[PDB]
Amino acid sequence: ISSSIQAIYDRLDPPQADQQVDRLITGRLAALNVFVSHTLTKYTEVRASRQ
Amino acid sequence: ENVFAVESGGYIPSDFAFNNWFLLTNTSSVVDGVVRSFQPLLLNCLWSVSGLRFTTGFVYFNGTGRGDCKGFSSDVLSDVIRYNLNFEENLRRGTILFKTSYGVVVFYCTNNLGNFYCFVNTTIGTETTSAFVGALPKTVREFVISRTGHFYINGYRYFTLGNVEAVNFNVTTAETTDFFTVALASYADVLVNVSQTSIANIIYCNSVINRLRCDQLSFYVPDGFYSTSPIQSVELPVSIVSLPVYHKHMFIVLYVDFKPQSGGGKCFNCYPAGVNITLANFNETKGPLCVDTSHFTTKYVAVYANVGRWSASINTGNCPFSFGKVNNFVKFGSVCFSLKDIPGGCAMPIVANWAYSKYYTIGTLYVSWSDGDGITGVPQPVEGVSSFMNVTLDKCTKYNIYDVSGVGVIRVSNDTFLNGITYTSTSGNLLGFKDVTKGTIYSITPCNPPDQLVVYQQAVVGAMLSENFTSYGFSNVVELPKFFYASNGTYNCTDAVLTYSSFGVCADGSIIAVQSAIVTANLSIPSNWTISVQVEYLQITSTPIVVDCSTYVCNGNVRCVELLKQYTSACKTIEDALRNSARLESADVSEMLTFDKKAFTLANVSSFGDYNLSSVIPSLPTSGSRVAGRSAIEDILFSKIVTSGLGTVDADYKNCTKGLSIADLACAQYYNGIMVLPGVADAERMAMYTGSLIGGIALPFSLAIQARLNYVALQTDVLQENQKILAASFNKAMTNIVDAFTGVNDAITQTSQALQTVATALNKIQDVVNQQGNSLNHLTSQLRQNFQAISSSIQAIYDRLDPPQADQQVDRLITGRLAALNVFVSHTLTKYTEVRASRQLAQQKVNECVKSQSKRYGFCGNGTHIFSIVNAAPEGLVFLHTVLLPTQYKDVEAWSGLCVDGTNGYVLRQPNLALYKEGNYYRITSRIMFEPRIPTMADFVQIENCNVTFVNISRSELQTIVPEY
Amino acid sequence: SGVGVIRVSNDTFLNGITYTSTSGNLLGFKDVTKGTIYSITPCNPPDQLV
Amino acid sequence: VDCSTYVCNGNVRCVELLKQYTSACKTIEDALRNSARLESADVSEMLTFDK
Amino acid sequence: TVDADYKNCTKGLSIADLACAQYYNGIMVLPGVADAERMAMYTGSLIGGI
Amino acid sequence: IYCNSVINRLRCDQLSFYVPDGFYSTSPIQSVELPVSIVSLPVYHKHMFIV
Ligand SMILES: *[C@@H]1O[C@H](CO)[C@@H](O[C@@H]2O[C@H](CO)[C@@H](O[C@@H]3O[C@H](CO[C@H]4O[C@H](CO)[C@@H](O)[C@H](O[C@H]5O[C@H](CO)[C@@H](O)[C@H](O)[C@@H]5O)[C@@H]4O)[C@@H](O)[C@H](O[C@H]4O[C@H](CO)[C@@H](O)[C@H](O)[C@@H]4O[C@H]4O[C@H](CO)[C@@H](O)[C@H](O)[C@@H]4O)[C@@H]3O)[C@H](O)[C@H]2NC(C)=O)[C@H](O)[C@H]1NC(C)=O
Ligand SMILES: *[C@@H]1O[C@H](CO)[C@@H](O[C@@H]2O[C@H](CO)[C@@H](O[C@@H]3O[C@H](CO)[C@@H](O)[C@H](O)[C@@H]3O)[C@H](O)[C@H]2NC(C)=O)[C@H](O)[C@H]1NC(C)=O
Ligand SMILES: *[C@@H]1O[C@H](CO)[C@@H](O[C@@H]2O[C@H](CO)[C@@H](O)[C@H](O)[C@H]2NC(C)=O)[C@H](O)[C@H]1NC(C)=O
Ligand SMILES: *[C@@H]1O[C@H](CO)[C@@H](O[C@@H]2O[C@H](CO)[C@@H](O)[C@H](O)[C@H]2NC(C)=O)[C@H](O)[C@H]1NC(C)=O
Ligand SMILES: *[C@@H]1O[C@H](CO)[C@@H](O[C@@H]2O[C@H](CO)[C@@H](O)[C@H](O)[C@H]2NC(C)=O)[C@H](O)[C@H]1NC(C)=O
Ligand SMILES: *[C@@H]1O[C@H](CO)[C@@H](O)[C@H](O)[C@H]1NC(C)=O
Ligand SMILES: *[C@@H]1O[C@H](CO)[C@@H](O)[C@H](O)[C@H]1NC(C)=O
Ligand SMILES: *[C@@H]1O[C@H](CO)[C@@H](O)[C@H](O)[C@H]1NC(C)=O
Ligand SMILES: *[C@@H]1O[C@H](CO)[C@@H](O)[C@H](O)[C@H]1NC(C)=O
Ligand SMILES: *[C@@H]1O[C@H](CO)[C@@H](O)[C@H](O)[C@H]1NC(C)=O
Ligand SMILES: *[C@@H]1O[C@H](CO)[C@@H](O)[C@H](O)[C@H]1NC(C)=O
Ligand SMILES: *[C@@H]1O[C@H](CO)[C@@H](O)[C@H](O)[C@H]1NC(C)=O
Ligand SMILES: *[C@@H]1O[C@H](CO)[C@@H](O)[C@H](O)[C@H]1NC(C)=O
Ligand SMILES: *[C@@H]1O[C@H](CO)[C@@H](O)[C@H](O)[C@H]1NC(C)=O
Ligand SMILES: *[C@@H]1O[C@H](CO)[C@@H](O)[C@H](O)[C@H]1NC(C)=O
Ligand SMILES: *[C@@H]1O[C@H](CO)[C@@H](O)[C@H](O)[C@H]1NC(C)=O
Ligand SMILES: *[C@@H]1O[C@H](CO)[C@@H](O)[C@H](O)[C@H]1NC(C)=O
Ligand SMILES: *[C@@H]1O[C@H](CO)[C@@H](O)[C@H](O)[C@H]1NC(C)=O
């Protein structure tokens, strides 16, 4: 429904709200896992550059 | 008796066996694992009753009527009563009675198909509606009643009774030896270690450190820096801001009335009598009731009594909001309600239910809307043209500001901006807003932004804060260039146990920053030499993991596998990335682990005399089935480190379908298609490699070890005093580090240089084990997650649905589970790249330190190096380095210049060193050190002069300097 | 629900009626009337081919 | 990254729901922490001094 | 930004700059491992090596 | 090729006419139809047909 997680809880009964929020949790954990790959990649490239 | 005194505050003492106390469940009790849950394990009172006599009593969850409590007490409203039974007549006679808010309920069991069945006598008005409820589980050892009427027997919820005031349990006891304990308990938040489906040990997530254990599912937390946000204030003011608007106002009031059936002539639970429902002002001759006004409010009115176990409610049904919840500033372009169906609108069922066990849509509310705005739902009435702004400055607040909502601290701010009315980050969070009527700018700070905690030896030793006051109960704060730091630090330490960029933290939690032969001189030199053994660990490998992608994704379901084929090469690319990287680890480690039979037979205590290397040489093959076995320090190390509850890598598949017992983690993850390959570095091949490499120093053996001293010290250190006493000193140092691995022994500061390295090594090894466990846990646990489908159980989808519709549900699970694999592949490949660097460092450490004698400083221990020992460790090699250190540190004087035949003078161009004379010898050494090592040609230049600051010598006495001048 | 081989097993456990992995798969169950414990093995777990 | 704060924006109901994502945050944030510790070690080793 | 400084991010006297705004999202840039002082020290020593 | 033999199934499931030397995971094909087993807690068997 929204990116504003508080707005989901403002709108909905908790059983239905939690299944909306599971979409945001699953998305945001994927967004972190992408950023971790960017970060680790850059450290490996930089480790070669430092050597 | 096996019963205990409750600790003050209500906790269960950490040594307790949990002998017949069960982890409660609504379903699916875990076999082995670490789990975090709310459980009734915080105890408000506990006592026992014993079968010499019997007493019958009614115990109220408010604590009334309880027994004589042990160790501690509290008078709060309990959530649960636990009865724990020592004895064998179980529930097969006697009764349990519940004073329910409307009457007495009796539970009892009977066998009058020779086994026992259980029945509940709900009694109302003195008519008894006796009901069956289940078979009795065979050996009742615990049963538990919640205040909300859940009844758990042996840790499973057999049924529910609805709210209870008081419980009585009534028994006649065959012996004086019979007893049961009783406990009144409250739901508390705990981390639990479960083995063979029984509680082994627990911790409570109450203290700052235990919360950091719980939130990482680990009983041990490795040293490091951990992010945490402190728990937020339990209830919050509300603040509201909006643009002024004409306050035309409306109430949507919904009234629900219904009656029970009664007297059994119409059966009390069977369908609601007397149902009446209305909206106010729903004159349906006008059509659906519509919100004409700018602000509206929703009210639900319960006209019915809560007679018996009857309840009623609105539910969201299929709407993107709930009735009631639309009062929270939800906005619409138009919204309308009806009790007759309306087109395109969702419907909210007006549900009555009895006992949460029979449910009736006594009506429904039909609701329809346009998105947009001009209609807002609000908590309470409003009037006129003027509109309030309601704000709670400087306190954490729940806000709805210009139709944006969240939680934070609202504060008036020094900025002025012409533009806009709300200000936001890239992430769309509110950062501030403008009071449009007044031109003031307010800023939003999230209350409890993340702090960061420094953990060292499983206490929080300090914290890093965005503000200048002592969170976490620390004593003092200091400013630093980019944050505040808070600690119980005395600022009187110099050795850092952790480092974080430019900053070192010492063991007190206190924080710090980190970084002559020319002269007739007085300089300070060790007249005695002492040796220390220093310990370092490098990971050599990680146990390769290969996943059968088809089995992981589809759980073996045949329809799923046919659908998975459409994901062209998706499995192929995942599983081949894991296979290729496993093949490279196997090649590299197998290349590294050499052997040499000659050196291996020499690698023995017989070959070392005074030097008690007995603890580090590989053991004889007492089994005969091997060339070698683990050393004493290897067995201590492998046994001292707890294999993770989150996922094993010591897998063995040859029992996983013989099936004589319920699967351990190794088989349980193999069922999910995850295979740990056999370790590339077998304990035999490690003992062979390591033994050969220790034997490489025997290639007279103590005299060769003494020759390694001679690179520091020629003349003195071959004297029997040094030969014997340095060997005795080595044996003492070895005795200290083998004790330190064997068990916790306190380090004084002098031993702490060595003993901190042992503590550092064990924390690094336990961290490697725990990271491997977590990586594997995150993969297996994702199978439990349903990716916006009906269920994670792929067979259940096919049980429910026609194949065309089922396959589109399953595509959600396939897409999710292929993403979960792709994440695990990145974890795995990352760890192999980190380990490849660690392995490369380790094999050059083997060359320089272990085989050679390293000429570097600080590369093998903080001290002057003589030799190294290696041993196996978890996924690892561990190193012992032996190093020589100043003692009896005092003046030994040093000379600029030497005067030759009393007539010619010698001046020296070797500033890296110090030059000194003793016992008819002259010796040149690093500026503060006691190396009896001789000077050389072209260190000295010669002049037709002498000075009184020189020493005096003939051209034959020059032989003490060199034979060459 | 699922597919697998159900087998009577040597274990005894007091707790629960169903037993599960971290992945939420059934690993076994208890016949509540009789106190026997049964274990579930998935038929055709992955082998590996050279 | 504080994975809990990134995913849930500090909302308390969300954090209780996020606990069900067993070790998902733990593996993200420990990968970032371990790699940060290695960068700090390597650069701190490289940047010598001689008065 | 990566030139972060957290010691103003809750004093709150002005609306957050990017450094605080991303810290609100739980993203922390650690202090640079190579401080301008430690760089000047390393570099100076290494130029002095001639 | 026809995905009938053990090796040809391993070719087909990798979309390759050539399979490189190595170790390949496979689960053998399952029995074509299955008995049904049912377990449930005892309950009062009041019964109805929706025809
Ligand atoms: C099998 O399934 C059943 C359901 O079929 C599960 O039953 C539920 O279990 C959960 C816990 O897992 C229960 O929640 C806890 O209930 C405690 C008692 O709550 C009742 O009384 C309080 C007032 O005393 C009411 O507020 C509750 O709810 C009502 O009020 C809210 C207000 O928002 C309404 O929304 C509801 O509609 C109700 O009208 C209940 O009537 C309660 O104390 C407990 O609170 C702690 O935990 C929450 C988070 O879960 C914290 O926010 C809160 O701050 C409390 O924790 C802190 O406070 C304690 C105080 O001593 C301190 O020690 C610490 O500081 C601590 O951090 C929580 O709400 C739920 O009520 C229950 N439902 C039913 C219907 O029974 C079973 O548990 C499950 N079994 C297993 C084994 O999994
Ligand atoms: C979680 O709970 C289980 C069960 O208590 C713990 O496993 C047990 O751990 C103990 C040591 O804490 C092991 O005991 C040792 O076993 C060896 C080998 O038999 C023996 O030589 C030692 O003298 C000692 O007895 C025990 O074997 C092990 N039991 C099982 C069934 O695994 C586990 O360690 C707990 N985890 C945590 C983090 O608390
Ligand atoms: C616990 O709840 C019980 C039941 O409501 C309370 O006991 C009753 O209290 C009323 C008012 O004093 C009396 O009329 C009843 O006769 C009491 N019954 C019994 C058996 O005592 C009790 O007072 C409550 N206790 C606490 C600590 O709140
Ligand atoms: C629970 O209620 C049932 C039904 O009222 C009780 O069983 C009846 O008890 C009376 C008196 O002994 C007998 O006349 C009936 O023939 C019984 N009916 C059946 C079906 O057995 C039962 O005794 C109550 N449970 C108790 C008191 O433990
Ligand atoms: C830092 O010092 C403070 C005292 O200045 C310690 O505070 C105690 O904490 C324990 C555990 O919560 C309490 O039982 C005590 O009552 C507290 N004492 C006071 C005076 O507040 C704190 O534990 C110390 N922390 C560390 C890690 O050293
Ligand atoms: C208590 O249990 C005994 C079992 O012998 C039974 O005879 C008695 O009627 C019970 N009394 C109550 C009040 O449940
Ligand atoms: C119930 O079990 C007891 C146990 O000895 C037995 O004596 C009695 O006959 C049984 N009653 C029945 C089957 O009705
Ligand atoms: C239904 O309930 C409402 C609210 O109490 C009331 O106005 C109305 O008279 C009741 N009866 C009918 C037939 O609507
Ligand atoms: C602000 O909201 C609170 C919440 O109860 C209320 O008590 C107070 O009257 C409100 N102030 C104004 C100006 O409406
Ligand atoms: C505060 O506001 C005034 C006027 O906007 C400005 O001169 C001053 O520099 C500001 N100081 C800070 C710290 O924002
Ligand atoms: C921070 O706290 C300390 C100790 O109370 C105090 O001396 C100092 O003035 C405070 N302010 C700053 C900016 O350091
Ligand atoms: C502070 O450290 C110095 C040097 O180690 C020591 O002499 C002194 O005793 C220490 N003081 C305390 C009490 O920590
Ligand atoms: C060590 O050497 C001695 C003889 O030098 C020999 O008797 C003994 O068996 C050897 N021990 C081992 C385990 O190699
Ligand atoms: C070597 O040290 C170990 C320490 O446990 C001891 O058991 C052994 O007897 C010692 N052997 C010699 C030759 O000193
Ligand atoms: C495998 O089963 C056999 C049965 O003979 C047993 O002896 C062995 O200990 C079991 N091993 C494991 C790791 O389950
Ligand atoms: C190295 O050892 C010396 C002498 O024990 C000690 O003063 C110094 O602080 C140590 N430095 C490190 C980095 O361990
Ligand atoms: C089989 O069960 C009995 C009793 O539970 C136990 O003594 C025995 O050790 C078990 N053996 C195995 C291999 O599970
Ligand atoms: C932080 O606030 C202080 C207020 O005294 C100000 O002097 C300083 O310039 C600010 N620094 C940053 C980076 O915001």
Residue numbers in the entry:
A (entry chain B): 858 to 908
B (entry chain A): 37 to 148, 163 to 565, 575 to 758, 768 to 1033
C (entry chain C): 455 to 504
D (entry chain B): 606 to 656
E (entry chain B): 707 to 756
F (entry chain C): 253 to 303
Question: Can you quote the paper on this entry?
Answer:
To provide further insight into how the 229E S-protein mediates receptor binding and ultimately membrane fusion, we determined the structure of its ectodomain by single-particle cryo-EM analysis. To facilitate expression and structure determination, the ectodomain (residues 17–1113) was produced as a fusion protein with a C-terminal fibritin foldon trimerization motif. In addition, a dual-proline mutation (Thr871Pro/Ile872Pro) was introduced to stabilize the pre-fusion form as previously described. Since refinement with C1 symmetry did not reveal particle classes lacking three-fold symmetry, C3 symmetry was imposed in the final cryo-EM map and during 3D refinement. This led to a final map with a resolution of 3.1 Å. In our cryo-EM structure, domain B is in the down conformation in all three monomers of the trimer and we see no evidence of molecules with domain B in the up conformation. A unique feature of our 229E S-protein trimer is the existence of a large opening that separates the monomers at the C-terminal end of the S2 subunit in the helical core and CD regions. The most pronounced effect of the monomer rotations is a sliding of one monomer over another in the helical core region of the trimer interface. This leads to the exposure of a significant proportion of the CH, HR1821-852 and UH surfaces to solvent, an outcome undoubtedly facilitated by the hydrophilic interfaces between them. The interfaces between the monomers of the trimer in the helical core region are hydrophilic in nature and this has presumably facilitated the exposure of these helices to solvent.
